[PDB]
């Protein structure tokens, strides 16, 4: 899942969307905005990071950590042993939060709702495969 | 007759004229200046919403209520059962206020005149607007 | 206390105007119907307050017109957020109309707020939930004031 | 020329004015039924040959009406590129050649029904440009019929 | 599938992407470009409409008919009996072509690769539901 | 947020509209007296505690009125930089802590008197933005009172 | 009542509407077209300044005189002793000209209407303008 | 003969409008009072011409209103410099009003001109004395014509 | 000192300089910048308002209070009894600080160094007279 | 101020110059290992406390290196908004407080290792702005350590 060619499209289009964004904080906030809009039950999971005000420093910080996590993972997609280690680390940071598969499918739809709106070219399937690669590493 | 095609034109031009925010107040202003200029005895019916000062907050809110009532009806012109139910409530909201029956044809003329001035005379169709406005005031007046 | 700000109002008016069908009532009926379904699901008793408009038959003309009226009421108020002096008059009006309705209480507006907060994310592109919750409070508090 | 680039651009502009952001996606059915009503009168063609028998209450006809408006939208929006437009017209021509009883005159009657209904809903419409560009469309759809 | 609220997002975002496109011919061509890029076996199905030159009038015409079909369907999404009739008509125009489910999934991915690149707001799930509504009506 | 950047910019804009090039430097006294009149009614505070005893004919009070409008002008014109504004509010807070009988509620009553008089002289005023930004000012001036 | 706050608003909006140079003539034009349309018998009072041709030099100078008289009063609204002395002279300048008392409320309405059209209805306050204009014509009419 | 030119008029109107208090009479009283003080200092007899408006008490309402009238008269005329056809009518009017005043002579307008030429440099930023002297002549000659 | 005509020039030119300034905080800071540059001994008098960082909120606040004081005084220059009362109030807020005449002459030079740089027209003498009016009211 | 807006913008600009469209997503690992090599020397900290024991051949450490560069990228790219940056620093501060043997000095040593490696790969780097903005980051991450 997420083969060597699919990684190229995802890395490129991540760069042209996230890596060229004027306001990385807004971009990261839009992503969690969608996720909440897609799955309102997800929002309460973030009571620890000041979700109540999505423009708080505390919540903007969380959003930046996650898109930062997304960025460091997409860059190591070709380094299978490095990312597996990094994914297992992320899995341990999510295990206590009792997440389910609907949470990860919602995050993926958020991811793929936000990313193409900052592009001229989008490969849906390549992105679905490689989001699954990450979510599957994080969900366990 | 407010025909299928009449309704389409009245819908499209109403949407363009009604617009957004404070610009709705512009439309409303044309109406009441014209109405109270032609029928200055009607102004007394609006004592509770300060009809003597149409630029006040009380009358501006009333003005915007009317425009919304009008917007409901234009939006429902294709759905007569819903249209009738909206006019029935509008009818309750106007009865036993001593409103002279001449106030309605006069309001229709002021409203059509304001819309024509917002969208442009050359784009305008008085027959379609008169037919559909009459179907609306026929449900209210009484 | 968190305020419906100038920027909060622009977001709401943008989300609203962009999901708005300017010329046709089908869409605003669909929005209100999902709202009431949500509202009645959270508070099965609330439905009895709407017997006068055939709430037990949500697909009837009688109830679909109540739908148009509520949505219209909201559209007018939302569009007045840039003229709050005017907005205040209009909410005091909505307030009195709801005082005349036996059973309606401020608690119902909290459920109504939850119903819109659930439905708008499904009709509105790029929906700002924070701006909506704060300006819906601004509007709804004005209607529920006094009851 | 007959339906020049400037003619086409006006027709596309006014067609789009009719189907603006408010009216697009809700008014096609009422438009198309009005067009057919105008067309049945001027052509004398039988509604029975159409799906749902011309019955504007019949879902079969409403969808038939939906296709016709769409095909018109498509042909009109391609007026600026005549090579692309000729191909779309030829496809429509082939589809109607497979249909018993479609005549060149009835095709002209339907194209003109579109102009006249557009003018009824858009009084500023440039009825000459529409006349020129609908006759070009009608000649393509009704070629050899 | 494709409920009354999901129809609103799809109709709006179809309008802001397809309905605001400068060059409807290019937009329609991009869609079949992706489809072919996503599933190279799909391309030969279009030997009748001059697929060999994707800039031919014959092939641009086909692309316009399909996005036109998409447009007339999305506009009647709320009129259940009308669209079912229209979908059944489209199904009959595709039945002889021996298409399979991979063809319709590829078309959907093409649809959802092209559409968001012309938007600022995209609801992935709403679009998946309502594309399924159409494809299921056409595939039979 | 409560009194956002957009809220502040509107309040500053409308405050400046009231004190435009024609009215600045001649209308402060009539404004401030009107504000105090509104304030004495809503607060029930005694004019006797003020210099000149609230006597709008007394030069001591007119100057007191002049300071109050100025301090408001200063606080308002600093709404766009909240770090600077908090310091100005704290200075005013310290000055009123040195004064017997200044309560948090009376401070709110004076801040609201400014909004209402501004709305009386500027009917288009955005009374919500004023409400938000005057309550932020009133909380700073009346903190711990 | 033309209150302290009324005077402030009338001062500020008058200054914005009155303006500079030929643009003052624009304001004056709105007034007399409206006044002579509503009360066309008043036009004969202006025979010496060519009231039949309001675009002439004679009437334009008179029009600009009135606006200046009005500007003196608006500027003096805060100084009643000076205000009264200005109205006294204005009163001499209008007496024994056969001016019907109805010409004044009508002039006030035309003037307020012109000002409203110059500064914008949404910014406008009819109560403040009517109260202060009445204090001015009460000093002139008689 | 030196003319109040198009450029002369722009300077004067700029100096005037920039020293002008649009909404308040205090400033234009202060300008007129320094003007009359100057005028009466140069011509102690002139003051007797203003007995009808209490010239012997320059701080009285009665005289301060005469101050507003003169300044207003000048402001109207200055503002008409771009429509001189209109300006001519207005000066012929001012002319007649000053003919009805026993004692007023063209020589007084020269002293008046000196009084403004002394006072304007003290209220007006970047004051163009040449443009003022020529357009004040243009105006004052029209009022003093015939007397 | 500061007669009725001199007040007009000062009020106008205060408005066109201070009243039209893009950044009233910068303008007020420039004024105390000059004062310090003109008289380095003056700076230590402001140790209570965070003078050590002239861009501090505490020191910007002080600068705004003073130019605000300047503004409210210049506007009441024509209301002799009001400004005398207000000047006596300001004098009492400065009496404990053991200021001397060199401090007030330095402030005046600062005032008249900063103000004309934001104007096209400046009347030096009118400003000297009316600054003296204020300083004399404040110094006692 | 220390790491002003202009300082921050330069650091972000040069950090982005290092990670331009060519180098982003392929050079993070070689950068981070170089940073750690510099850091182990200057700090004297044991590689054994790190995942994979500092072994740049160990996938556990390469991922650890990947997190550290990312967290730096995130903190740096947030330098223009100090409220957001302080929160990110506090999260990192809390994460390292949970770790036995992280000292304030070692944190300074790691922040400085980032500047020096950036200067090695970007000779034009403004080493003063980096010094100021990395010390602000190091004080946030190593607060109370
Ligand atoms: C698949 C992609 C995801 C990535 C890359 C990701 C990344 C992260 C990161 C970097 C953190 C911060 C860890 C730290 O440094 O403390 C975090 C925390 C968290 N994540 Fe995710 N995450 C993902 C998916 C999800 C999903 C699907 C949900 C739930 C719908 C979720 C819920 C949370 C929660 C609840 C926290 C803890 C917030 C707190 O500290 O209170 N994450 N995530
Ligand atoms: C298309 C025609 C009209 C529409 C859509 C319309 C709409 C409305 C609406 C929505 C209200 C608010 C009802 C409420 O909440 O109490 C209202 C009130 C009212 N309307 Fe109309 N109206 C129309 C014609 C007229 C005319 C012609 C008159 C009189 C000449 C009139 C006089 C009034 C009065 C007196 C009220 C009550 C005012 C008050 O609240 O004190 N309306 N109208
Ligand atoms: C922002 C929130 C709301 C808006 C904009 C709104 C608007 C309206 C409007 C325009 C009407 C028609 C008034 C009339 O014609 O007399 C109405 C009626 C009514 N409203 Fe609301 N409303 C809101 C919230 C609520 C809530 C939360 C409840 C109760 C749960 C409620 C209960 C009713 C009832 C019982 C009626 C009368 C029903 C009938 O006409 O038979 N409203 N509302
Ligand atoms: C401007 C002229 C016309 C246009 C734009 C037009 C357009 C269309 C379109 C787009 C279709 C759908 C084709 C398909 O997908 O199978 C269609 C079908 C059809 N048209 Fe026309 N048409 C025109 C004139 C006419 C006329 C004049 C007649 C009758 C005399 C006619 C009779 C039919 C019939 C019977 C069908 C087939 C219905 C079915 O079997 O499903 N058309 N037309
Ligand atoms: C689900 C969305 C689809 C829509 C709205 C659609 C629409 C259309 C339309 C309008 C036509 C032209 C019919 C005519 O007027 O003659 C057509 C033809 C055709 N479609 Fe589709 N289609 C869809 C999906 C697909 C898929 C998934 C494939 C294959 C991967 C496909 C293959 C074809 C072929 C082979 C033709 C015939 C071309 C020819 O005439 O030689 N379509 N389609
Ligand atoms: C928005 C609220 C307020 C503002 C902006 C404001 C502003 C000011 C300012 C600028 C001063 C001058 C300080 C100085 O230079 O010494 C002042 C003084 C004073 N204020 Fe306020 N004030 C407010 C509310 C109040 C309230 C509510 C009271 C009374 C209950 C009050 C009572 C006084 C008194 C008595 C003085 C001192 C007069 C003296 O001893 O010279 N103020 N205020
Ligand atoms: C605020 C209200 C008014 C103001 C400020 C005003 C102002 C003036 C002024 C300054 C003059 C010049 C006096 C002179 O130098 O002889 C004048 C003349 C005159 N005004 Fe008025 N006026 C007002 C209302 C009216 C009205 C309501 C009427 C009649 C409807 C009127 C009729 C006249 C006439 C007949 C003259 C004499 C015309 C002439 O010179 O032949 N005025 N007015
Ligand atoms: C540009 C120069 C002048 C202007 C614009 C001007 C303007 C005016 C105006 C508007 C009036 C009121 C007319 C009325 O209400 O009847 C007036 C009155 C008068 N003017 Fe002048 N004037 C000027 C020069 C002079 C000079 C130089 C003198 C004599 C030295 C003078 C002597 C008088 C007198 C005696 C009156 C009547 C005083 C009264 O009302 O009791 N004027 N002037
Ligand atoms: C002549 C024009 C001046 C004006 C309008 C003025 C105005 C002010 C104002 C408004 C305050 C703040 C009072 C408060 O609300 O607490 C103040 C404080 C002060 N002024 Fe001035 N001032 C002037 C001249 C000077 C001069 C010439 C100096 C010294 C060179 C000076 C030194 C101070 C000091 C030391 C403080 C106290 C700062 C503190 O709170 O620690 N001022 N001034
Ligand atoms: C500028 C200074 C530093 C930055 C930016 C930084 C950044 C990070 C980040 C982003 C993580 C991952 C946190 C997580 O997701 O759990 C981390 C973990 C860690 N850091 Fe640091 N760090 C810094 C300094 C240091 C220093 C000086 C030491 C050692 C003395 C250190 C030791 C560790 C260790 C041992 C872990 C945890 C590995 C694990 O248990 O998974 N860090 N650091
Ligand atoms: Ca985009
Ligand atoms: Ca794009
Ligand atoms: Ca300069």
| DSSP-based three-state secondary structure for E19 | coil
How far apart are alpha carbons G41 and G43 in whole angstroms? 5
Q: Where are the alpha helices (DSSP H) in chain B?
A: 4-18, 22-38, 57-76, 80-92, 103-119, 126-140
How far apart are alpha carbons G38 and G47 in whole angstroms? 18
CA atoms lying within 13 Å on the CB side of residue F119? 19
Q: How many Cβ atoms sit within 10 Å of the Cβ of residue E62?
A: 23
Element (H, E) at G7: helix G4-18
Distance of CA D81 to the CA centre of its chain: 18
Contacts of A60 in chain J (CB under 8 A): 81, 84, 87
**Is the Cβ of G68 closer than 8 Å to some Cβ of chain H?**
yes
- Determine the length of chain J: 145
What's the gap in Å between the CA of G129 and the closest CA on chain B?
A: 11
Q: Could F4 and C8 be called an inter-chain contact, meaning their C-beta atoms sit closer than 8 Å?
A: yes
Contacts of D28 in chain C (CB under 8 A): none
Pocket of ligand 6 (CB under 6 A): F 45, 49-51, 64, 67-68, 71-72, 92, 95-96, 99, 102, 106-107, 110-111, 137-138, 141; I 89
Q: Quick one: resolution in A?
A: 2.4
Contacts of I28 in chain F (CB under 8 A): none
Pick B85's closest partner by Cβ from C62, C90, C93: C62
Method of determination is X-ray
How far apart are alpha carbons I84 and B44 in whole angstroms? 53
Contacts of F34 in chain G (CB under 8 A): 4-5
Task: Answer yes or no: is J95 a known binding residue.
Answer: yes
How far apart are alpha carbons H57 and B100 in whole angstroms? 63
CB H19 within 8 A of CB H124: yes
CA atoms lying within 13 Å on the CB side of residue H86? 22
Q: How many Cβ atoms sit within 10 Å of the Cβ of residue F99?
A: 9
CB I74 within 8 A of CB F66: no
Helices I57-75 and I80-94: crossing angle, nearest 10°?
150
Helices F127-141 and F82-97: crossing angle, nearest 10°?
50
Mutating to test ligand 2, I would choose from B28, B93, B97 the residue with most ligand atoms within 8 A of its C-beta, which is B93
CA atoms lying within 13 Å on the CB side of residue A82? 21
CB E8 within 8 A of CB C19: yes
Angle made by CA atoms E117, E120, E122, in degrees to the nearest 5? 75
How far apart are alpha carbons I23 and G28 in whole angstroms? 39
Q: How many Cβ atoms sit within 10 Å of the Cβ of residue H100?
A: 8
Q: Which of F107, F136, F122 is nearest to F39 (CA)?
A: F107
**Is the Cβ of C86 closer than 8 Å to some Cβ of chain B?**
yes
Q: Where are the alpha helices (DSSP H) in chain F?
A: 5-18, 28-43, 59-77, 82-97, 104-121, 127-141
Alpha-carbon separation of residue H106 from D59, H96, H103, H113, H147 (angstroms): 96, 13, 10, 11, 6
E43: DSSP letter:
G
- Its sign, for the CA torsion C112, C115, C117, C119, is negative
How far apart are alpha carbons F54 and F65 in whole angstroms? 9
Q: Could C34 and E121 be called an inter-chain contact, meaning their C-beta atoms sit closer than 8 Å?
A: no
Burial of G52 per CB tally in 10 Å (0-12, 13-18, 19+): exposed
Mutating to test ligand 8, I would choose from H94, H99, H115, H142 the residue with most ligand atoms within 8 A of its C-beta, which is H94
Distance of CA A121 to the CA centre of its chain: 19
How far apart are alpha carbons J93 and J111 in whole angstroms? 13
Alpha-carbon separation of residue F55 from C123, F37, F52, I88 (angstroms): 60, 11, 6, 18
C interface mutation test: which of B8, B69, B75 has the most C CBs within 10 A?
B75
Burial of D71 per CB tally in 10 Å (0-12, 13-18, 19+): buried
Q: Touch between chain A and chain E (3+ CB pairs, < 8 Å)?
A: yes
How far apart are alpha carbons H139 and H127 in whole angstroms? 18
CB G104 within 8 A of CB G140: yes
Burial of D143 per CB tally in 10 Å (0-12, 13-18, 19+): middle
Ligand 5 centroid vs E75 CA: distance in angstroms?
Answer: 18
How far apart are alpha carbons D23 and B12 in whole angstroms? 7
Q: Which of A57, D60, D88, D92 is nearest to E88 (CA)?
A: D60
| DSSP-based three-state secondary structure for G54 | coil
- Determine the length of chain F: 145
| DSSP-based three-state secondary structure for J126 | coil
Largest interatomic CA distance in chain H: 40
How far apart are alpha carbons F68 and H35 in whole angstroms? 36
Q: Which of E85, E75, E88 is nearest to E12 (CA)?
A: E75
How far apart are alpha carbons D84 and D57 in whole angstroms? 35
- Determine the length of chain B: 142
How far apart are alpha carbons J78 and A68 in whole angstroms? 11
Q: Whose CA is nearest to atom 42 of ligand 3?
A: C98
Burial letters J13-44, b for 16+ CB under 10 A, else e: ebbeebbeeeebbebbbebbbbbbebbbebbe
CB B132 within 8 A of CB B7: yes
**Is the Cβ of A16 closer than 8 Å to some Cβ of chain E?**
no
How far apart are alpha carbons B38 and J41 in whole angstroms? 92
Q: Which of B136, B115, B142, B127 is nearest to B12 (CA)?
A: B115
How far apart are alpha carbons A61 and F13 in whole angstroms? 33
**Is the beta carbon of J141 within 6 A of some atom in ligand 10?**
yes
J99: DSSP letter:
S
A96: DSSP letter:
G
| DSSP-based three-state secondary structure for C100 | coil
How far apart are alpha carbons C143 and D77 in whole angstroms? 48
Secondary structure percentages of chain B, helix, strand, coil, to 5: 75, 0, 25
Domain-by-domain residue ranges, chain B? Answer: 1-142
- Determine the length of chain D: 145
Q: Whose CA is nearest to atom 4 of ligand 1?
A: A66
Nearest atom of ligand 7 to the alpha carbon of G67: 5
Task: Answer yes or no: is J109 a known binding residue.
Answer: no
Q: How many Cβ atoms sit within 10 Å of the Cβ of residue G47?
A: 9
Q: Who contacts E58 (Cβ-Cβ below 8 Å, separation ≥6)?
A: D87, E49, E50
DSSP-assigned states of every residue in J16-30: HHHT-TTTTTTSHHH
Ligand 9 centroid vs G60 CA: distance in angstroms?
Answer: 54
How far apart are alpha carbons F16 and H146 in whole angstroms? 49
């Amino acid at each position: 899942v997420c083969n060597r060619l699919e990684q190229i499209l995802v890395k490129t289009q991540w760069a042209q969307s996230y890596g060229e964004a004027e306001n990385r904080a807004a971009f990261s906030r839009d992503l969690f905005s969608e996720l909440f809009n897609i799955q309102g039950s997800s929002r309460a999971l973030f009571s620890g990071v000041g979700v109540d005000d999505m423009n708080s420093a505390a919540f903007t910080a969380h959003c930046l950590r996650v898109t930062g996590a997304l960025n460091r993972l997409i860059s190591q997609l070709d380094q299978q042993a490095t990312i597996n280690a990094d994914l297992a680390h992320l899995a341990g940071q999510h295990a206590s939060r009792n997440l389910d598969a609907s949470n990860f499918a919602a995050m993926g739809q958020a991811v793929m709702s936000v990313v193409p709106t900052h592009l001229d070219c989008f490969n849906q399937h390549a992105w679905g495969e490689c989001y699954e690669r990450i979510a599957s590493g994080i969900s366990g | 007759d407010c025909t299928s095609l009449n309704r389409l034109l009245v819908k499209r031009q109403w949407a363009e004229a009604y617009g957004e925010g404070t610009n709705r107040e512009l439309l409303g202003n044309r109406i009441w200046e014209d109405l109270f200029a032609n029928m200055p005895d009607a102004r007394g019916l609006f004592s509770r919403v300060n009809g003597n000062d149409i630029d006040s907050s009380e009358f501006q809110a009333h003005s915007l209520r009317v425009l919304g009532g009008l917007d409901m009806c234009v939006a429902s012109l294709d759905d007569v059962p819903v249209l009738n139910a909206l006019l029935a409530r509008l009818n309750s909201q106007h009865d036993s206020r001593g409103i002279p029956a001449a106030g309605y044809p006069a309001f229709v003329a002021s409203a059509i005149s304001a819309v024509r001035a917002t969208v442009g005379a050359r784009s305008f169709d008085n027959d379609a607007w008169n037919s559909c406005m009459n179907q609306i005031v026929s449900g209210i007046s009484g | 206390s968190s305020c419906c700000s100038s920027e909060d109002r622009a977001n709401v008016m943008h989300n609203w105007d962009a999901a708005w069908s300017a010329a046709y009532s089908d869409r605003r009926v669909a929005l209100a119907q999902a709202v009431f379904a949500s509202l009645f699901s959270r508070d099965a008793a609330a439905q009895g307050l709407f017997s006068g408009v055939s709430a037990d038959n949500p697909d009837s003309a009688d109830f679909r017109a109540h739908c148009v009226r509520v949505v219209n009421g909201l559209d007018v108020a939302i569009n007045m957020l840039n003229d709050p002096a005017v907005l205040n008059e209009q909410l005091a009006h909505l307030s009195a109309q709801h005082q005349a309705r036996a059973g309606v209480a401020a608690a119902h507006f909290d459920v109504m707020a939850e119903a819109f907060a659930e439905v708008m994310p499904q009709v509105s592109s790029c929906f700002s939930s924070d701006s909506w919750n704060r300006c819906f409070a601004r509007i709804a508090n004005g209607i529920s004031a006094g009851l | 020329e007959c339906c020049s680039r400037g003619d086409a651009e006006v027709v596309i502009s006014e067609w789009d004015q009719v189907f603006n952001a408010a009216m697009a996606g809700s008014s096609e059915s009422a438009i198309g039924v009005a067009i057919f009503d105008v067309f049945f009168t001027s052509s004398g063609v039988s509604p029975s040959m159409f799906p749902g028998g011309g019955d504007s209450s019949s879902a079969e006809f409403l969808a038939q009406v939906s296709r016709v408006i769409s095909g018109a939208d498509i042909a009109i929006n391609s007026l600026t590129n005549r090579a692309t437009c000729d191909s779309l017209l030829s496809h429509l021509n082939a589809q109607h050649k497979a249909i018993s009883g479609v005549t060149g005159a009835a095709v002209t009657h339907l194209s003109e029904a579109i102009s006249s209904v557009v003018a009824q809903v858009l009084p500023s419409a440039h009825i000459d440009a529409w006349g020129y560009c609908m006759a070009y469309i009608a000649a393509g759809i009704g070629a050899g019929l």
